[PDB]
Design a protein around this ligand. Structure first.
Ligand SMILES: *[C@@H]1O[C@H](CO)[C@@H](O)[C@H](O)[C@H]1NC(C)=O
Length: 361
C-alpha cells in the first residue's frame, strides 16, 4: 500500500511548538512525502517560500536514512489561483513551456515526481487538464531515457461529485497518473448554517447535504468513472473543522453563527490541527456520528468535527477492503508531529495509526 503524506512549506512559520520543518518528519512513516506548494512563474515551475531550496534539501536528506522514501513536489494549491492554471493549460505553448521546465527543476532539487494540485478545474478546463496530464507524463517518459528512474506523476482531485463531473476526465487522466489522491475531507458545504462533518465515511441518517457528500460515495464514483482501484488513494485529514454554535444545541443540525475561533498555533478560523484538538478535548464532550463513523467534540460555544485514531484506522481498513492503492494524509504538520499534545508520547499518532493498519492482513 502507499502512504502519501503532505508537508506544507508555510508550517515553518507557526509560533512555538507549531513550527514544523521537514527534519521533524519520520523518514520511515510514509512511502511518499509531497512538499507543498511550488509556484509557476514565467510559465515554469518555481519555488514559493524564500527558503524553499533549503527546505527541499532538508526533506530530500530524509532519504539518507530511508533510501526507499519517494518525494514529490506539488504545484498549485489555493494561494496560486485556479485561473493561473487555466491560462497555462489552455494554450499549447504555455503548456509546453511548463512541462519542459518540470524535470530539470525536480532533478536539481532531488524530487522523484510532480503532484498536480489544481484547485479546481472548471468545465472549460476539463479537456486541458487531460492534455496537461498526458503531455506531462509523455515528457517524464522521455526524460527517463537519460538513465534515472522515471519521475512520478500524481494529482490531488476533488472528492465532490459535482466538482468531479465539472472538471475531470477521470477515465483518461487515470491512465497517465501514477496515483490519484482523493480529497475526501471537504464534505461540509461553506453555505450550511448548521454543524456537520467534513470527512464522513458514509452518509448520515438525517438530511445528509447529499447521499454524495461522503468518502464512500466518492470512492465508488471514481471507480465507476474508470479510475482503477490501484491508482486511487483515499485522503484522510489530520486537521479538524470548527464552528461557533448559535445555541446550546450540539447534535445533528445544531445551528452555527460561523466558523470556530482560531487555534493558537494554526491561527485560521474554522480549522484546527490535531495537536490543537488533542488539547481542546480537555474539558470537552465527545460524540461520534454512528453511521458516518467519525467523531465530534464540543465545549463552550465551540464545536469541532475531527478524525481520531479510531476513525483513521477505520478509513484505512475501508480503503484496503476496496483494494485501493493506499492512503493520503493532509498534512504531517497538522498531526501531533512532536508527540507531546495527545497524551501518548508518540509522534504522528494519526499517520502512524494509518500506517499500522495498512501493514496488517
Ligand atoms: C509566483 O509567481 C508569480 C507569477 O510570476 C509571481 O508574481 C509571484 O511573485 C510568485 N509568488 C511567490 C510567492 O514567489
Amino acid at each position: 500500500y502507499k502512504l502519501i503524506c503532505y508537508y506544507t512549506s508555510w508550517s515553518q512559520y507557526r509560533e512555538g511548538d507549531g513550527s514544523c520543518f521537514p527534519d521533524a518528519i519520520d523518514p520511515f512513516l510514509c512511502t511518499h512525502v509531497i512538499y507543498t506548494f511550488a509556484n509557476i512563474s514565467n510559465n515554469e515551475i518555481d519555488t514559493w517560500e524564500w527558503n524553499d531550496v533549503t527546505l527541499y534539501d532538508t526533506l530530500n536528506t530524509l532519504k539518507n536514512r530511508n533510501p526507499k522514501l519517494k518525494t514529490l513536489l506539488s504545484v498549485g494549491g489555493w494561494n496560486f489561483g485556479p485561473e493561473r492554471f487555466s491560462k497555462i493549460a489552455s494554450k499549447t505553448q504555455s503548456r509546453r513551456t511548463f512541462i519542459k521546465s518540470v524535470p530539470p527543476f525536480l532533478r536539481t532539487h532531488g524530487f522523484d515526481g510532480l503532484d498536480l494540485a489544481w484547485l479546481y478545474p472548471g468545465r472549460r478546463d476539463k479537456r486541458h487538464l487531460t492534455t496537461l496530464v498526458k503531455e506531462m507524463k509523455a515528457e517524464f517518459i522521455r526524460e527517463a531515457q537519460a538513465g534515472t528512474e522515471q519521475l512520478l506523476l500524481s494529482a490531488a482531485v476533488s472528492a465532490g461529485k459535482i466538482a468531479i463531473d465539472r472538471g475531470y476526465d477521470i477515465a483518461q487522466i487515470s491512465r497517465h497518473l501514477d496515483f490519484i489522491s482523493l480529497l475526501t475531507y471537504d464534505f461540509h458545504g461553506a453555505w450550511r448554517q448548521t454543524v456537520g462533518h467534513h470527512s464522513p465515511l458514509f452518509r448520515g441518517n438525517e438530511d445528509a447535504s447529499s447521499r454524495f457528500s461522503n468518502a464512500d460515495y466518492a470512492v465508488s464514483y471514481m471507480l465507476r468513472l474508470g479510475a482503477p482501484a490501484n491508482k486511487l488513494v483515499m485522503g484522510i485529514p489530520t486537521f479538524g473543522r470548527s464552528f461557533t454554535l448559535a445555541s446550546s444545541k450540539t447534535d445533528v443540525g445544531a445551528p452555527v453563527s460561523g466558523p470556530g475561533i482560531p487555534g493558537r498555533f494554526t491561527k485560521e478560523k474554522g480549522i484546527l490541527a490535531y495537536y490543537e484538538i488533542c488539547d481542546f478535548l480537555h474539558g470537552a464532550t465527545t460524540h461520534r456520528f454512528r453511521d458516518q463513523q467519525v467523531p465530534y467534540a464540543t465545549k463552550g460555544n465551540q464545536w469541532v468535527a475531527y478524525d481520531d485514531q479510531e476513525s483513521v484506522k477505520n478509513k484505512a481498513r475501508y480503503l484496503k477492503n476496496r483494494q485501493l492503492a493506499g492512503a493520503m494524509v493532509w498534512a504531517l504538520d497538522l498531526d501531533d508531529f512532536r508527540g507531546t499534545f495527545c497524551g501518548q508520547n508518540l509522534t504522528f499518532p494519526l499517520t502512524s495509526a494509518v500506517k499500522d493498519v495498512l501493514a496488517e492482513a
